[PDB]
């Protein structure tokens, strides 16, 4: 029902490659789940430290 597929190389890939560019991310401002750097651009200091 929620059967989803990944390999270990592809999964380690998208674990590494999720913050810098993201295919699922919205590339137009004003939409949710934007690029991680743009989300950081408005993030709070506590938020960014949790990211660290």
């Amino acid at each position: 029902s929620n059967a989803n597929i990944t390999s270990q190389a592809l999964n380690e890939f998208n674990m590494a490659t999720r913050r810098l560019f993201d295919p699922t991310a919205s590339n137009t401002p004003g939409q949710p789940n934007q690029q991680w750097i743009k989300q950081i651009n408005d993030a709070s200091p506590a938020t960014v430290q949790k990211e660290i």
């Binding site: 993030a43 709070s44 200091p45 506590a46 938020t47």
Partner: peptide, 30 residues
């Protein structure tokens, strides 16, 4: 009796501290 301007100045100043501390806490993200 006429009100001393010190009291009104302090009341306005206190409202500014309240507003500005809420803004700073907002900027921290809280």
């Amino acid at each position: 009796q006429p009100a001393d301007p010190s009291g009104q100045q302090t009341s306005t100043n206190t409202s500014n501290l309240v507003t500005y501390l809420t803004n700073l806490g907002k900027y921290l993200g809280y």
